[PDB]
């Protein structure tokens, strides 16, 4: 969960760079991709949770 909190805000800021142009989308997609894996990660836990 905190991972997402961390990894999302990153991805969150990353777009802000692409919003500032400070990143390209490659940073973005991967960053987004980088994020999504987090989501992929977490759900399993809850899955595992149950």
């Amino acid at each position: 969960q905190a991972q997402k909190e961390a990894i999302y805000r990153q991805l969150d800021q990353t777009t802000q760079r692409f919003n500032v142009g400070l990143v390209a989308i490659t940073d973005v997609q991967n960053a987004r991709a980088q994020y999504d894996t987090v989501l992929a990660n977490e759900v399993t836990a809850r899955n595992n949770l149950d």
């Binding site: 805000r9 990153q10 969150d12 800021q13 802000q16 760079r17 500032v20 142009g21 400070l22």
Partner: protein, 106 residues
């Protein structure tokens, strides 16, 4: 010699001509750096301007934004520097010549 000998002239109306050739480029030399001055500084300007938008956002790292904002601060100072360089040159280029701030019979 631009004037009419023995005529009366206004102030600073330049009736002679030095050869600007040396200085004229000399003025340019500063005019070059000023551009270089504004250039490097302008980019700094954009840099802070971008970062400023980061302000309150994540990566900004108040130190770092400050780093550029300095660079903003720092670069523009150089901007002021070159501008004078242009200025000193210009006043050394259009300096020539007319004339004894006084406006009178030549």
């Amino acid at each position: 010699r631009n004037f009419k000998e023995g005529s009366d002239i206004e102030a600073g109306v330049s009736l002679y001509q030095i050869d600007p050739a040396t200085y004229q480029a000399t003025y340019d030399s500063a005019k070059g750096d000023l551009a270089k001055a504004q250039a490097a500084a302008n980019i700094a300007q954009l840099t802070v301007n971008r970062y400023q938008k980061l302000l309150g956002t994540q990566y900004i790292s108040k130190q770092e934004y400050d780093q550029a904002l300095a660079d903003a601060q720092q670069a523009n100072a150089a901007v002021t520097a070159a501008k004078a360089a242009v200025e000193t040159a210009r006043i050394n280029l259009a300096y020539t010549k007319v004339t004894s701030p006084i406006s009178g019979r030549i």
